[PDB]
Amino acid sequence: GAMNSSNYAELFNNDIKLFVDDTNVYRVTVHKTFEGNVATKAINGCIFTLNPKTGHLFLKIIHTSVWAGQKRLSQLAKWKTAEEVSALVRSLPKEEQPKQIIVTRKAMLDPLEVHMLDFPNIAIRPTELRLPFSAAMSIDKLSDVVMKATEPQMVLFNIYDDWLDRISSYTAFSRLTLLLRALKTNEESAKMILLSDPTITIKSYHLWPSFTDEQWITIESQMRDLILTEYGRKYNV
């Protein structure tokens, strides 16, 4: 059924799987109207579909036009996400289709399960983990491609850059979750940490900087410090 700390190494075995995160699919800014009422304006979003073993990210850009003339958008967003995931699966060769799809929010279980009825052997699962995928839009290159998009569009990334050349997927996923958690708790500070040293750059074909092994330790330490810092600032400890 659900996914928690007790079955954590399952993410990195050789059964193909994908996390789906729908947090950034329907995104709005709230503002006052001339009559002093409130109104929302939507902005591009994205579905965050990730293979945790390979780092392969299928970033589906959700262009605001998909909401035009629609009603009950937060509920439609779940079903649009499920449609898009089910289309992706179908677009993949059989040997590439997932055996399981873990949703990061339980509200996606029925929409996805109904869209995937043609795929009875693909298990749709929830998780007990608080994964920080909502901070994906704090990755500048991902934010940039979403906000410039003028039509629906699928862009592929490897969220781990070249890291699997030197470390395992377990460690790579941990590094990713730690970076995203930090971006989610203090974006400014997290980004400050990531780019303080102008001599470490982000390769054109990467998302994160080119840190040596030792520099990643330093970075990872500073992200931990920040997550504790902000926890100390939040709760006054």
Binding site: D110, V114, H115, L117
Partner: protein
């Protein structure tokens, strides 16, 4: 008015006849039930004194034959049988009626309760679920599973109810996933009413039959089947005005008849609250909602 004589009553048993029940003692001189209304299906049912395990009974219609009950001491239960010899049967009944060894079907004249609970339950339609073609009456008990339960194990002893499953290709049209799932009007009206059942009367009889098997035998899969059909109407935005009105009456008399003390098990909190308070028909079941609220306000 018709009669189901008993050969004898060797073991102590609570006998039930439609919504009434009475106690027979071991080897009491009991020879059956007389004055049974013609025009309706009926159900005689049984719960033994010594092993309250296994409630079991027979659905039957007096117009389809002469039926009697005889205890089988090998299989250990009261069995319905058909008497093909008409004069023999008439002669048996008359003697027992003369000796006044038969209880009378207690029909109060103001009382339409059985009619309202069996408005669409016919004996031949009943025979399409409880498969046993060499008898005109149908046996049911507490433990019989349903076709759909056996998918999730003996087929000959199953309750072939209509398979309803909201997360199934039958229920969901390709390209209408959200539409059909949040508004089952297409599963209801095209798949089930037009297509599997033929009319709203057949849909109502199964639902009515489902409830009764749950109530009288504590058959869990019937209760699931009863809940499954209620949920499918309530969850449909488009339902003919007359089906809604009838549903409200059907349900009212079921809730009215339910033993107050068995509500905790026979009634599914999630289905009822959704049906009465969330679903499309939340304003379409005035009678049922008023009796549910005054009688079972705890469930809500």
């Amino acid at each position: 008015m018709n009669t189901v004589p008993f050969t004898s009553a060797p073991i102590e048993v609570t006998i039930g006849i439609d919504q009434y029940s009475f106690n027979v003692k071991e080897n009491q001189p009991f020879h059956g039930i007389k004055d049974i209304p013609i025009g309706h299906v009926h159900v005689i049912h049984f719960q033994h004194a010594d092993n309250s395990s296994m409630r079991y009974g027979y659905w039957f219609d007096c117009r389809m034959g002469n039926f009697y009950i005889q205890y089988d001491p090998k299989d250990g239960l009261y069995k319905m049988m058909e008497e093909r010899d008409g004069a023999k049967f008439e002669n048996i009944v008359h003697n027992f009626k003369e000796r006044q060894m038969m209880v009378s079907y207690p029909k109060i004249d103001e009382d339409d309760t059985w009619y309202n609970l069996t408005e669409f339950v016919q004996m031949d339609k009943i025979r399409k679920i409880v498969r046993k073609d060499e008898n005109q009456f149908s046996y049911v008990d507490s433990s019989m599973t349903t076709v759909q339960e056996n998918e999730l194990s003996d087929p000959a002893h199953s309750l072939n109810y209509t398979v309803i499953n909201f997360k199934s290709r039958e229920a969901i049209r390709p390209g209408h996933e959200m539409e059909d799932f949040l508004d089952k009007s297409y599963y209801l009206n095209t798949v089930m009413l037009q297509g599997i059942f033929k009319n709203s009367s057949n849909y109502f009889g199964e639902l009515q039959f489902a409830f009764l098997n749950a109530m009288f035998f504590g058959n869990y899969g019937s209760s699931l089947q009863w809940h499954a059909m209620i949920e499918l109407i309530c969850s449909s935005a488009t339902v003919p005005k007359h089906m809604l009105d009838k549903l409200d009456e059907i349900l009212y008399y079921q809730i009215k008849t339910l033993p107050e003390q068995y509500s905790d098990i026979l009634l599914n909190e999630r289905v009822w609250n959704i049906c009465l308070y969330s679903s499309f028909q939340k304003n379409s079941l005035h009678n049922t909602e008023k009796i549910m609220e005054n009688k079972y306000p705890e469930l809500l």
